[model samples]
Target: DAIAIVGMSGRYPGARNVREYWDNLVHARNAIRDIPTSRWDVDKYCKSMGMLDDIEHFDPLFFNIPPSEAELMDPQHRIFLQEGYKAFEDAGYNARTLNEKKCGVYLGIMSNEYGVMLGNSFAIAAARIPYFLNLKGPAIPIDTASSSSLVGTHLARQALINKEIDMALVGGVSLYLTPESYMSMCEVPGEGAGALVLKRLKDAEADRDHIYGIIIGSGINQDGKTNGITAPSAKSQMDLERDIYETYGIHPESISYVEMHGTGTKQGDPIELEALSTVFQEKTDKKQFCAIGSVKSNIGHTSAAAGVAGVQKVLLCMNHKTLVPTLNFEFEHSPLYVNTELKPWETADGKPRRACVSSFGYSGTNAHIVIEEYQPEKRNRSALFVLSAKKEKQLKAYAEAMKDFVTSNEDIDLEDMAYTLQTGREAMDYRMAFLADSREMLIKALDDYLAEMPNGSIFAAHVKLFETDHDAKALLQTWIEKKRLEKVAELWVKGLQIDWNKLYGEYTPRRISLPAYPFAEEYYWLP
Candidate 1:
């Protein structure tokens, strides 16, 4: 779409981060199970819902918020803050870089699940990110039942297209806390939080940003005078998709995959299928030309977070060039076929891979988003890969994440990863840097570090923040110019800040997506 999704982060059932989430989808793992024992006596209720562990955990020290206050804050706010920060970090920007960027935050939040406190208010949840980051643009809390996140995305996309904001963070969070919520919905309630960093495609390209996928178009429509406020309206869904496709000039035949609102209800699934496939059948007589799947099958219905969860799934598919399998997929008859395995996503008719996402809320607000893959012109280090964290164990965790990231993603350029680590990440206390132009060498060094074995190529130290001599700059410049990278690494770990911009002044490098820090979380729930 005209609006580019530059960055994203998420937390969901059976997945602590995006990496785990991708793995679960690829393997068709079902995330719906029993709620936690500590969520308070689920004995009266049968087990089977999507859940996230340690809901009471928060890293107040990392965010510079007091522990007492952090304990008082809603868990949703805490999770969103962490995920939103990582979204920007994944987008190759951080607090030091994104400060005062006129970045807006649009959040989709359904219920005050953690209420009995002011922190759980939707308005406060929406504004928290801006307050934490000192953002200059607007922050609006949105609610439209389950379609909240996609509608929020549509709003953010428009703001960018209209130049109302330079950048935006579109996200949603949902938690199934009350037994009353569980009783009302037929679908298993899921808990999740997802955030995306967005920018105008032109601006993203100009800024040399990594564009995950383009939102060619997005539209939101309501089922006015519906049979019931919470009832699904087939006509509304069909009309919205048709209008968005027509408005954006997106050919229905060209979209080979669609992330559907598949909550798995017998009637709900059929109506969604009829409404969506009906549009495609009009343009193309070909049957089974398009593939469709609902993440709901794996993770259940994630309340407000469902929309962004689907969006994340789509982006992951586009990244891996593999269509993730739908868990226990089913359909009697339709123009669309369900993807039952993680297989290659072949381009549609030689056009860039295109897809659509639908989030139909019980509130009668149905949102449809048209997505098209953006192939960027293409990496790195001469090469130095550095990692740091507030704590040492977390530093090793970062190393483990990177090692696995490079191993699983064979298509990525190693140098771009090096570049991303060297400059994209914010420096912390415990640091390690290694110079390796080859993948094997880099992986080997990380292996040695993780195993507590010594490796000459790896440098590790806890910075003391020592006062440096006056000639530090000239010496470092010579070290960098002469390919004496180890010397630069030594000083970096010894509490010296490296001027990354100066190091790559002559040639700019492409910043790519990398794993974000894994916070050391501790329990902070209200007693």
Candidate 2:
């Protein structure tokens, strides 16, 4: 069975979430900049680096993390924790519901900028995620350098195929907090963290989950007996591609694009292109039919987190039906067309939008993944748009953001947006619901709420308690069965928790991506 990427969350240089990342890519925005002063004195070392803003900012109360413990924890772990929660929320699974399932957590990491300096191991970066999320399946931390995150994704796919876990959270994190690696290496250091929720294709379809794409095949191999321990092997790279095609029956010509591990290194680029041309040149006469690009060109080399960053980039491109331009790619003599401008991804010979991602580690480890677009079946249904937050100010921010989104994206389905907001998100204390039968009505409701002039159809209130006594629970059950949404909202405001699963037992609605929670942030750096 193929594995499906149902949801994704990430923080990268110049982008805080997946949406912003897509925008950066489509516009060919370069995230590489001078190293932040908070990290170190950049003038002493290299002139540029791809850096993430607010690495030390986190919402501890949301995750129930104490201020003292959070300060000592690595920023990598903190970001991963928040992304993990967002991934589940993006997948339309409640955090409370996920704790009851055998979900696995696989993290790819290489450097421990914070931990190594503190005399601690980096293994905790992966271990702490499962502990915080209450995941019961395997919790593994992989370290294969650049290929670590892609290898983690491959492991998650295997576990799902073997029925070892019902759901999987796979990601990678890399941060340059210290100058240890940067001082010795040739790479322009970067920081990023990414997470993806995976499920079996059949299960995801049956559950009506929002599938980004399907992972049909994946291969990992080592460049045995290379010239040096850290040197890459073109022969090994070719062999890896051959194995994938032969094993999975994939045609090289069918692939429209490739998310290459183009680190912009002098030696690495040539070796990678040589191997790619060697494999793709066979059984095809077409030149420049396939497009190639790299995220590293835009965000610098992210090291361990680089693999999944490429994967997310390709997925975003496929979803938007546009091939984003590659930044700083000036090579003109290659068989593969280095995309330099945003354009439509056209498919030849009536084929689907197929792509591949490659991540080659300097330590001889390599990983490749084959992905294809997923065209969802459409259905229209009336929905109730819901919004919530921990504080009033945060709720207002959410309202403002939603208003902008609804106003800008004229083609968005109102029902799908409402469904995602109502079912996918956690019902916080401050809440608002707008019952709308059409897209225009929904937009109008959001506009009214943002204007602080609510219509009669809009319901907004704060709940002091989320748990209710047994008598209230029984009374709410009747209202839930009768589809009394207004009554349910009224009771919810009075601290009554409804069983959403039972309430939606007969209805099947797919989850769609919506604006995530606007976390109230405060700095918590280690002194």
Candidate 3:
């Protein structure tokens, strides 16, 4: 309940991180540019691309990584590193301070197209040792389709709730390379990565950190036994939204803004809009307190990062007091101008304020979250203990020092006393308990994380969490926090300028594989 977002950051097709992103939104700037590169024949593919024109120029040094490690890391991971570090800095947390805090990371990285491309290339040059490629290097595949952002967010939240980490760096990112494959793949709806930094509200209040809004509630669902994986079931999405309102018992009119999973495709957009009208119609007038937009309209679908990107847009609007105009949306054919009816509403500060974000994945994964203007508590009396460390000994010293400090400060105000520690491991964890304005409903969340950890266990646990936990409501808030934390560490660790072998592990050299000769005796390779 104490978790409040103090800062946010991101990078997308038209804009790099929140500053450019917000500017694009306010000025109604369009990053969608015509395909210019002669590198690949894109004429046969989509003629225009909302592609990031300056990705090559995206310096990893900003996040503090050496050129060597930066070169080897997956582009997706590198993007995460770039955006993650920027997000931490945006939140006013120093690199050393971040390492000392109890933090975890949850990233929504759906497809590692760069890894697949590079790995296949290596496989070509060295046929005998193709599998030797550690495609997971830097880029751990966290692909789960459209809900990928929420998936990462959920994992982060789970980690936080389970006491896995004190603060979470959570969000999503997507890097698309290969024009041929980009066109061949099913139409993805959006693009770019967005990130948020979450810490206990008590901590924010004590530190005098700016509170953006409280992530009051969240919900996720899937279309059970839908026609197939590709099917976008409106009923499933509607049910999830309906259940969220019912569970929270919050009136629909209370929600001032509504950001939908509008992919801009012909069929998907209408279906999603209809679902929105269906659910919210019961309680509130669709014309008021409702405005919608899609990040996909400005940026070609970023796939996994789309959800969080929307979240960041909303947060920026709330912070700067400006509503982002929907680019290319007025030209839409549908009479049901979903975003039009609601209209992008701005705050008194001339910024857009308060909203909900929804994302639907191809595999029937549906997620929705509600975020509002973060307002710090009027009275602040708590202390947020930040545990900073790199290795175990540093963590031990930090924890001991914190314990001693807390003991010595017993006479001081303990009402706001809370502790969060950070350390170096595959993952990090933190636990804390706080009372909401009311004590009737207790809230607990865990932030679990792993930088490119194995997917088998993580995915299995994810399935279990979604399937079994009826209590899991705030998916976006929790996940965003966890992701923010991990990314914070990852960026710095990568930037530490350490040797790849020492930091990650020994890299065994192997030849790159190539397609076998047409006349080769290996007939199976004939195809």
Model 2 stretches astray by more than 4 angstroms: 116-120, 263-265, 329-335, 378-382, 438-444, 447-458, 464-485, 499-508
Best by TM-score: 1
TM-scores of the candidates in the order shown: 0.92, 0.91, 0.62
Expressed as tens digits, the lDDT of each residue in 1-527 for candidate 2 is 68999989988999999888998888889999976666788676566888888988888877777888778778888888888778777788776667657888889988776755551355677767677767888888889988999999989999999999999999998887777677655547677999899999999988888899999889999999988787788888999988998789998888889998774455778788878877887756667888888888889888888878999999999998899888773234444787787999887655679899999887889999999988777564346567888888889888887877777688887756766776687788898876667667877887888788846667888872325367756666787677677776565544555555555665555578776777777788776
Score candidate 3 by lDDT: 0.52
Instruction: State residue 346's C-alpha deviation in candidate 3, in Å.
Output: 6.2
What are the clash counts of all predictions, listed in order? Answer: 3, 1, 76
Clashing pairs in 1: 1-214, 1-215, 1-216
lDDT of each candidate versus the true structure: 0.84, 0.80, 0.52
Ranking by TM-score: 1, 2, 3
Tens-place lDDT per residue, model 3, 205-240, is 666555667675677778778676777888988888
- Stretches off by above 4 angstroms in model 1 are 329-334, 378-382, 407-412, 451-458, 461-472, 505-507
- Model 3, residue 362: displacement in angstroms? 1.5
TM-score of candidate 3 against the unseen true structure: 0.62
Instruction: Give a tens-digit lDDT track for model 1, residues 1-527.
Output: 48899999999999988889999999899989876567755777646788888878887878888999887888988998889889999998876777798999999988875666436678889988888888988999889878999999999989888888999999999886667677676537788999999999999999888999999989999888877677677788889988988888888878889998874455567888888888887777777878898898888888788889999999989878889888772344456888887889997465788889999887788899988888876433458788999889889988998899888877767767877887788888899988887788878888998998866778889972234555756767788778787887777876788887665656767799998978877888775
